[PDB]
Design a protein around this ligand. Structure first.
Ligand SMILES: CCCCCCCC/C=C\CCCCCCCC(=O)O[C@H](COC(=O)CCCCCCCCCCC)COP(=O)(O)OCCN
Ligand SMILES: CCCCCCCC/C=C\CCCCCCCC(=O)O[C@H](COC(=O)CCCCCCCCCCC)COP(=O)(O)OCCN
Ligand SMILES: CCCCCCCC/C=C\CCCCCCCC(=O)O[C@H](COC(=O)CCCCCCCCCCC)COP(=O)(O)OCCN
Ligand code: HEM
Ligand code: HEM
Ligand code: HEM
Ligand code: HEM
Ligand SMILES: CCCCCCCCCCCCO[C@@H]1O[C@H](CO)[C@@H](O[C@H]2O[C@H](CO)[C@@H](O)[C@H](O)[C@H]2O)[C@H](O)[C@H]1O
Ligand SMILES: CCCCCCCCCCCCO[C@@H]1O[C@H](CO)[C@@H](O[C@H]2O[C@H](CO)[C@@H](O)[C@H](O)[C@H]2O)[C@H](O)[C@H]1O
Ligand SMILES: [Ca+2]
Ligand SMILES: [Ca+2]
Ligand SMILES: [Fe+3]
Ligand SMILES: [Fe+3]
Lengths: 743, 743
C-alpha cells in the first residue's frame, strides 16, 4: 500500500518464507523426536518402569521447580547440576565399576589405562546402541545397565529426600532440605531422569548421532560434536561476516541521499492533546512497573545469595519457605511481568492519542480491569509457585495452578490462560484506539498498519504457549516454549518497541514519515529474517535432527548482522535530542534508547553469537555464559526499553515534574555500570573457566560440586556483590525517581 | 608534527607496542623451539641418524621443491600429502601392526575394538612421551618404533625413486617420475620427515601439548585441539565482534561532521606537469607487469592441470622438465614479482612528481638499471628453480642459487640478495625524489612524512628474509619467513598503496589534506595494530607455545575489524568519480580501487577469519580453504591495486589514449567474475569437504589419495575450468588493453 510496494512485499515474503521454515521443520521436530519407550525391561524379563511412570516422573519433576532447580538437556538453572548429564556420568561410572568387578576384581579408577580403554570401548557398544524396538514398545537393556540404573537411582533417592549423608551437597546445589515429601514421586523422577539421559546417550537408526544430537559432552561413550555440527558452525561464521560486510556495502552504496532536513516544530506536539482519564489511569501501571522492578532486583540479589552462601542466610534458614527454585522462579517471572507491563503501559498511552486525542467508549474502565487483572495474575502466579514448590498442593492440580516447571513459563496454566486473556484484552483496548483511526476514508494508514500488525503479533502469539499439556513429550515442550520466549519476547517486543518508538518520534515531528516508515519496515524485515527461524538455536540439543541445527545456525547468524551495525540508529536517534529545544524534557528516555542500542550489540550481538554456533553452544549450553547473555539482553534491551517508555509516559501524565538530573544520573549510570560490572567481572570469567572445564573433561565436570567450589569460583561469584550493590543503587534510584514523579 | 599530535603519537605507540610484542615473543619462538636431537638411537644401542643427517635431509628436501611439492607442518602445497602427517599416520599404523603381531598374531584392522582401544592406549604412552634427553643429546626410542620408522622409510624411499609400484600414486600427488636421482638424499629426507613428525607427536616437558601445539589431527595418539587453543579461539571471536561493533559505535559518535565540501579544480593537475624521461621510462615497467601477469595466469592454469590430469598433459609428458613443483614455484614467484613491480612502477611515477615536476640528477639511468636488474632477478631466479628441481645442480650450491624450498621465498639466496638490493635501489630512487621536497624549509611535510616512513618500511623490511641460513632450524625459518610474507606483503603493501593513493587523490584536489591525512593515519594505525603482531597466526602449529597462539588470535581478530567495515572508503573513494568532469579518464582505475575494497572484505575479512581462530585453523591448515583466501586476497587486494596503479600510470604517460570501454569491461568483469567463480564453485566446496573429512577421521585423511580421488572431488576440481577460462579472458583482455595502450 502507498509508495511502499517494495518494502511491504519484502516484509510479507520474509514472513511467509521464515514461517514456512518454522512449520515444515516443526513437523520434523514432532516426528523425529526420541521415543518414550512403552515398557522398559531388563534382558532377563523383569518388568521395569514404562512410559506412564516416566511421564508421572516428568510431572513430579515439574512439581519440585522443574527447570529452576537444575537443567534438563541444558535448559535450566545453573547451580544444581544438569540432571541428564549427572545421571549419565553416574550411570556410566556405575557400569564401569560393574564391568571392572567381573573382569579384573577392582574398580575403574584402580585399573591401568589399556584396561580402561578396553572398558570404554565396551561402553561405546551398549550405550550408543540398544534403542527402542522399532515401534515394538520395548527397550530390553542389559542386566549390568539395569544394576547401574538401580545403583544410581539410590543417589537421587537420597538427594531429594533429606538424607544427612548428602547434606553439604544440597547446600552446594542450593536445594532445600526435604525437596520431595513423597517417596513414589522421587522413584518416578529418577525414571524421568533416566529417560532424559537415555535419549542423550543412544544413537539414532542409521546415523552416528544420538537423539539429542550427541549433546552431553562425555568422552566415556564418545559424545563429541558431530561432523555437520562443525560444518554448519563454520558456515554460520562465514554467513555472519559476509552478512555484516555485505550489509555495510549495500547500505553505503544502495542508499537514497535526499537530505530533506525536516524542521522541528516549536512546541511539543503531545502536550497539545488533553489529559484524558485513559492517560491518567496509567499511574498505576507506572507504579506496578517499578514496584515489580524493585522486587525483581531484590529477588535477583536473593537468589544470588544461595549461590555464594548455602541455605541459611545469616542465621536461621528460610530455605524451607523460600528455596532457590522459588526465588529464581520469582526473579524470572516478575522480570517478564514488568517488561511486558511497561510495553502494555506504552501501548495504552499511545492508543487514545492515535484516535485523535480522545478515548473510545468504556476505556478507563477497561484499563482499570486490565490493571487489576494483571495484579491478580501476578499474585495468583506467585502464590501458586509458593504452594507448588513447598508441596502444600495436590499433584493432580499442580500444572494448572502451581508450577509448570519450565523456565519463562513457570506460572501455572490457569494463570497463563489469565495472562493470555489479559493480553487479548489489551489487544482489544489497542484496536479500539487504532481501528477508528483506520476506518476513516483517508490516506493516513502508512505506518499505522505496521503498528497494527505488530500489536496483533505481540497480542496473539502468546497462544503458542499452549499446544503442550501436562504430560506431553519434552521435545514438544521445548519447541512451543521458545515460540513465546524467542519469537515473542525477543522477536515481537523488538517489533513493537521500535515501531511505537518510530510513531512517537514521527508525531513529535523529528522524523517525517520517510525515515519513520522506510527505516521501520527495513528495521522490521532485517530482524524477521533471522529472528523467526532462529528459534531453532534453542532446539539444537533437545530431541531434534541435524537440519534443525542447520536452519538455526545460518538463520541466527543473520540476526546478529543488523545488531552489530548499531552506530547508526544510536546516533541517528541521539541526534533527535539536538533538534528541538523542548527535547530536554525527554533527555533521559532518549539516553536509555541509546543504551538500548549499546546492549543490543554487546548483549545480543557479541555475547549472543559467542554462544550461538553449534560447536560453541555444545560446550556452553547450561553454563555461566548463558546468564551473561540473558542479563545483558533481557535487561539491557527490553529492560531499558521498558524503563525508557516508563520515563516517557512519566512525562505527559505528570508534565510539571522535572526528572531531577543528579538522581537520574545515578539511576542510569548505576544500572549500566552494574550490568557491565557484574557480567564482566563475575559471570563471564566463571563461564569461561566452566567452558575450559567442559571442553577439557566433560559437561558433567563443569556443573559438579567438585568444580563449582574450587575456591577460585567461590570468590569469583562472591565478587558479584561489587557490581550488585551498584546495580541495586541504580535500580533503587530509578524506583525512587518514578515514585517521586507519580506524586 | 603539525596539528596531528594525537594521530602521529597513536601510530608511534601502536608501532612500538606491536613491535615489542613481536620481539619478546620471537625470543620465545627462538628458545621454546623443538630440539633437533643430536643422536637418535634405538633402545638396544645401535646408532641411527643424528641432527647432521636430519639437517642434510632438510637441505635435500629443499632441493626437490620444498614446500611446493607437499606440506610440512601445514605450510606448503596441497596436492601431495602433508609429509609430517602422512609419515605420522604411516608410522603409527606400522607401530600398531608390530604391536598386534606379538600380542594377537593379526594385524590392526583384523582385531576387535576393545583390543584396538587397548593398543591405542599403548600408543599414547610411547609417542606422547620419549622426547629428548634434557640436553643429553639422545632420543633413545623403542625397537618397535625403530622397526616402524625403518618400515615407513621404505615407502618414501620408493616414492621419490621412480618405482613402478608407487606409480599412479605419483600421478595423484602430481610429483614427477624420478624426483630424486640420488639414494642418500632420499635416505636423509626420510630422517627429516621423521623429525618433522616426531616434533609433531611428542609432548613438552610438563604439559600435555606437543611441540607443534598438538597439531596434526590424529585420534591414534590423541592429537586434538588443546584447552587454551579453544579458549583463545572463542576469545578471538568475541574480540572480533566487539571490535566491529565498538568501531562502528566510535565512528558514528566520535566524528567531526564539518562538511567543508572542497571544490574540485577544472583541470587534471597531473597533466600540467611535463613528461620527463623518468616518467616515460615506465613503459617497460608497465609492460613487464602485464607480461608477468599473463605468464602468471598461464602458469596458474598449467599448475591446475596437474591436479585434474596426471603428469602427461594430453600426450607425451613434460613433467620431467616442468613438474608441478616448478610451475607452482613460478606461479607463486612471478605473482609476487608483478605485484611488487606494479607498486615499484607507481612509486617511480610519484617520485619526480613529488619534487615539483622535475627529475633529480641521474634518474632515468637509475630507472633503467633498476628495470634490467628486476628482469635479471626474474630470469635468474626462474633458471635457478629449473636447475634445482630437475637436479642438474650441485647440492652445495643449491640454496644460494637454485631453490630455497620455502614458499613465497622460493628464489635462491643470491637472487634474493639481488632482489633486496633492487628494492634498496628503488628506496634510493624514491628518497632522491622525496627528500629534496622535504629538505626545503617549509610546512608541506604533513602527509609526505607518512609516505616517507611507508616507503622506508616497504624498502627495508625485506631484510627480515635473511636471519635464516641453509641448515638452520625450521621454526626459525617459519618465524622470519612470515616477517616478509605477512608483515611486508600484507602489511607494507597496504600501508604503501593507501598512502600513495591518498597522495594521488590529494594532488588531484579531490580530498583536501584533512581527509588525506586524518583518514590516512587512522587507516594506517587500525591496520598496524592487528597486522604487526598478527604474524603469529602463521606460527600457531609450527614449534611455538600457547602464548604465541594467544597473541596471534587476539591481535589478528583486530585486523578483520577495519576490513569488514568497508562500505566507507569504497563509496568515499567512488563518490569522487562524480566530483570532477575530467575524472572519466580515471573511471577504470577508480573502479578497480572499488573492487580492491570488495575483495578486502570478502577475501581478507570473511575468508580470512574463517581460517583464523586456532580451533578452526587446526582442522584447516593445509587444506583447500587456504588457496581460497590466498587467491581472493593476493589477487583481489594486491593484484587489483597493482592493476589500478598500472592503468593509472597508463594515463599521464600515454595521455592521448582512451582506455576503450568494451574491452576494459571484459578485463574487469572477467577477472572479478572468474575470481568469484573459481573460488565459490570449486575451491571452497573442496575445502569444506576436506574440512569435514579432517574433523571426522584426521588430517592424514583429508590429504591422502584415497580421498582426493573420491570421484566427487575429481569433478569438483575439474570444474575449475568454467571459472578459469573466464579469468583467462579477463586477464587476457587486461594484457591486450595495456599493450595497445603502450604503443
Ligand atoms: C575487559 C573484559 C575482561 C573480561 C575478562 C574475561 C576473561 C578473564 C578470565 C577468563 C578465564 C580464562 C580461563 C582460565 C582457565 O581456564 O584456567 C584453568 C583453571 O583456572 C583456574 O584454576 C584459575 C584461573 C584464574 C582465571 C580467572 C581470572 C579472573 C580475572 C578477574 C575478572 C576479570 C586452568 O588451570 P590449570 O592450571 O589447568 O589447573 C589448576 C588447578 N587444577
Ligand atoms: C572474553 C574477553 C572478552 C574481551 C572482548 C573485548 C571486550 C568486550 C567489550 C568491552 C567494552 C567495554 C566498554 C567500553 C565501551 C565504552 C562505550 C561507552 O560507554 O561510552 C559511551 C558512548 O560514548 C561514546 O561515544 C564513546 C565511543 C568510544 C568507544 C570506545 C571504544 C558514553 O560514555 P561517556 O562516559 O559518556 O563518555 C566517554 C567517552 N569516551
Ligand atoms: C555461493 C555460495 C557458495 C558457498 C559454498 C558452496 C557450497 C558448500 C557446500 C560444501 C559442503 C559439503 C559438505 C558435504 C560433506 O561433508 O559430505 C562429504 C562429501 O561426500 C559427498 O559425497 C557429498 C558430495 C556433495 C557435496 C558437493 C557440494 C556441491 C558443490 C556445489 C558448488 C556450489 C562426505 O559425506 P559422507 O559420505 O557422509 O562421509 C563419508 C566419508 N567420510
Ligand atoms: C542486582 C541484580 C541481579 C542479580 C544479582 C541477579 C542474579 C541472578 C541469578 C543468581 C540468576 C540465576 C543464575 C542461575 O540460574 O544459576 C539470575 C537469572 C536470571 N536473571 Fe537475574 N539478577 C539481577 C537482575 C536481573 C534483571 C534486572 C533482569 C531483567 C530482566 C534479570 C533477568 C534474569 C533472567 C532472565 C535470568 C535467567 C537466566 C537463565 O535462566 O539462563 N536479572 N539472575
Ligand atoms: C535481543 C534480545 C535477546 C534477548 C532478550 C535474549 C534472551 C535470551 C535468554 C533470556 C536466554 C536464556 C535461555 C535460557 O535461560 O534457557 C537466551 C538464550 C540464547 N540466546 Fe538470546 N536473546 C536475545 C538475542 C539473541 C540473539 C540476537 C542471538 C543471536 C545468535 C541469541 C542467541 C542465544 C542462544 C544461542 C541462546 C541459547 C543458550 C542456551 O539455551 O543455553 N540471543 N536468550
Ligand atoms: C586462471 C588463474 C589461476 C589459476 C588456475 C590458479 C591456480 C592455482 C593452483 C592450482 C594453485 C596451487 C594449489 C595447490 O597448492 O594445490 C595456486 C596457488 C596459488 N596461486 Fe594461483 N591460480 C590462478 C591465478 C592466480 C593469481 C592471479 C594470483 C595472484 C597473486 C595467484 C596466486 C596464487 C598463490 C599465492 C598461490 C599459493 C597459495 C598457497 O600456497 O596456499 N593465483 N593457484
Ligand atoms: C589483505 C591481504 C591478505 C593477503 C594478501 C593474504 C595472503 C595470504 C596468503 C597468500 C596465505 C597463504 C599462506 C601459505 O600459502 O602458506 C595466507 C594465509 C593466512 N591468512 Fe592471509 N592474507 C591477507 C589478509 C589476511 C587477514 C586480514 C587475515 C585475518 C585473520 C588472514 C588470515 C590468514 C591465516 C590464518 C592464514 C593461515 C593459513 C595457513 O597458513 O594455511 N589473512 N594469507
Ligand atoms: C569452528 C571449528 C570448530 C572445530 C571443532 C571440532 C569439533 O570437535 C571435534 O569433532 C570430532 C567429530 O566431529 C571429534 O571426534 C573425533 O575424535 C574422537 C576421539 O576422541 C573419535 O571418537 C571420533 O571418531 C572422531 O570423529 C573430535 O573429538 C573433536 O576434535
Ligand atoms: C569456537 C568454539 C570451539 C569449540 C570446539 C572445541 C573442540 C575441542 O575439541 C576437544 O578438545 C579437548 C581438549 O581441549 C579434547 O578433550 C580431551 O582433553 C584431555 C587431554 O588433556 C583428555 O581428558 C581427553 O583426551 C579429552 O577429554 C576433546 O577430545 C576434543 O574433542
Ligand atoms: Ca536458563
Ligand atoms: Ca600455501
Ligand atoms: Fe533465541
Ligand atoms: Fe597472515
Amino acid at each position: 500500500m502507498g509508495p511502499y510496494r517494495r518494502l511491504w512485499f519484502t516484509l510479507i515474503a520474509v514472513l511467509a518464507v521464515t514461517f514456512a521454515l518454522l512449520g515444515f521443520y516443526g513437523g520434523e521436530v514432532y516426528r523425529q523426536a526420541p521415543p518414550i519407550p512403552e515398557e522398559v525391561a531388563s534382558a532377563d524379563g523383569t518388568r521395569l518402569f514404562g512410559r506412564d511412570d516416566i511421564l508421572d516422573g516428568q510431572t513430579a519433576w515439574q512439581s519440585i521447580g522443574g527447570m529452576q532447580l537444575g537443567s534438563i538437556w541444558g535448559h535450566g538453572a545453573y547451580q544444581a547440576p544438569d540432571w541428564t548429564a549427572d545421571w549419565l556420568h553416574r550411570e556410566l561410572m556405575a557400569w564401569l565399576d560393574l564391568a571392572a568387578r567381573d573382569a579384573h576384581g577392582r574398580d575403574y579408577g584402580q585399573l591401568d589405562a589399556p584396561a580402561q580403554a578396553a572398558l570404554r570401548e565396551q561402553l561405546k557398544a551398549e550405550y550408543r546402541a540398544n534403542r527402542a524396538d522399532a515401534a515394538g514398545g520395548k527397550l530390553t537393556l542389559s542386566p549390568r545397565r539395569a544394576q547401574a540404573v538401580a545403583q544410581t537411582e539410590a543417589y537421587y533417592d537420597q538427594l531429594f529426600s533429606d538424607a544427612p549423608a548428602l547434606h553439604r551437597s544440597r547446600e552446594n546445589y542450593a536445594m532445600k532440605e526435604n525437596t520431595l515429601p513423597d517417596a513414589n514421586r522421587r522413584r518416578q523422577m529418577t525414571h524421568f531422569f533416566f529417560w532424559t539421559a537415555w535419549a542423550a546417550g543412544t544413537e539414532r537408526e542409521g546415523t552416528s548421532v544420538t537423539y539429542t544430537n550427541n549433546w552431553p559432552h562425555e568422552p566415556l561413550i564418545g559424545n563429541h560434536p558431530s561432523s555437520e555440527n562443525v560444518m554448519w558452525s563454520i558456515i554460520s561464521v562465514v554467513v555472519l561476516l559476509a552478512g555484516i560486510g555485505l550489509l555495510i556495502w549495500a547500505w553505503a552504496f544502495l542508499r537514497g541521499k535526499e537530505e530533506d532536513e525536516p524542521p522541528a516544530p516549536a512546541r511539543d506536539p503531545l502536550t497539545t492533546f488533553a489529559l484524558t482519564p485513559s492517560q491518567r489511569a496509567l499511574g498505576k501501571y507506572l507504579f506496578l512497573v517499578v514496584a515489580l522492578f524493585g522486587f525483581q532486583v531484590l529477588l535477583g540479589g536473593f537468589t544470588a545469595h544461595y549461590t555464594v552462601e548455602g541455605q541459611k542466610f545469616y542465621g536461621i534458614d528460610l530455605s524451607q519457605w523460600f528455596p532457590y527454585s522459588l526465588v529464581r522462579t520469582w526473579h524470572i517471572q516478575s522480570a517478564l511481568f514488568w517488561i511486558a507491563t511497561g510495553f502494555l503501559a506504552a501501548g495504552l498511552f499511545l492508543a487514545p492519542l492515535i484516535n485523535g486525542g480522545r478515548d473510545p467508549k468504556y476505556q478507563k474502565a477497561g484499563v482499570d480491569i486490565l490493571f487489576w487483572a494483571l495484579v491478580l495474575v501476578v499474585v495468583g502466579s506467585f502464590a501458586g509457585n509458593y504452594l507448588a514448590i513447598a508441596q502444600i498442593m495436590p499433584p493432580d492440580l499442580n500444572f494448572w495452578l502451581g508450577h509448570q516447571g519450565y523456565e519463562y513459563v513457570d506460572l501455572g496454566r490457569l494463570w497463563q490462560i489469565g495472562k493470555f486473556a489479559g493480553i487479548c484484552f489489551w489487544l482489544v483496548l489497542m484496536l479500539r484506539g487504532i481501528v477508528p483511526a483506520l476506518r476513516t476514508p483517508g490516506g493516513d494508514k502508512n505506518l499505522l498498519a505496521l503498528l497494527t500488525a505488530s500489536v496483533g503479533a505481540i497480542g496473539l502469539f502468546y497462544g503458542a504457549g499452549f499446544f503442550y499439556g501436562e504430560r506431553t513429550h519434552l521435545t514438544v515442550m521445548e519447541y512451543w516454549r521458545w515460540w513465546i520466549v524467542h519469537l515473542w519476547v525477543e522477536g515481537f517486543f523488538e517489533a513493537f518497541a521500535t515501531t511505537a518508538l518510530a510513531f512517537i518520534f514521527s508525531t513529535l515531528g523529528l522524523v517525517s514519515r520517510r525515515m519513520a516508515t522506510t527505516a521501520s519496515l527495513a528495521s522490521a524485515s532485517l530482524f524477521m529474517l533471522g529472528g523467526i527461524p532462529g528459534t531453532f538455536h534453542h532446539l539444537y540439543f533437545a530431541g531434534t535432527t541435524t537440519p534443525v541445527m542447520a536452519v538455526g545456525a545460518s538463520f541466527s547468524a543473520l540476526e546478529v548482522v543488523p545488531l552489530i551495525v548499531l552506530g547508526h540508529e544510536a546516533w541517528e536517534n541521539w541526534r533527535l535530542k539536538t533538534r528541538a529545544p523542548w527535547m530536554e524534557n525527554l533527555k533521559w528516555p532518549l539516553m536509555c534508547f541509546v543504551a538500548v542500542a549499546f546492549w543490543n550489540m554487546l548483549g545480543a550481538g557479541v555475547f549472543g553469537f559467542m554462544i550461538n554456533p553449534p560447536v560453541s553452544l555444545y560446550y556452553i549450553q547450561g553454563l555461566n555464559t548463558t546468564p551473561v547473555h540473558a542479563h545483558a539482553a533481557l535487561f539491557g534491551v527490553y529492560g531499558f526499553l521498558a524503563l525508557g517508555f516508563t520515563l516517557l509516559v512519566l512525562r505527559y501524565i505528570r508534565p510539571q515534574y522535572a526528572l531531577s538530573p543528579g538522581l537520574m544520573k545515578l539511576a542510569f549510570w548505576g544500572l549500566n555500570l552494574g550490568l557491565a560490572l557484574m557480567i564482566f567481572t563475575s559471570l563471564l570469567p566463571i563461564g569461561l573457566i566452566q567452558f575450559h572445564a567442559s571442553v577439557s573433561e566433560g559437561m558433567w565436570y563443569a556443573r559438579s560440586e567438585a568444580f563449582m567450589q574450587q575456591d577460585i569460583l567461590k570468590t569469583l561469584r562472591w565478587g558479584r556483590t561489587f557490581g550488585d550493590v551498584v546495580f541495586l543503587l541504580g535500580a533503587l534510584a530509578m524506583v525512587v525517581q518514578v515514585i517521586l514523579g507519580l506524586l
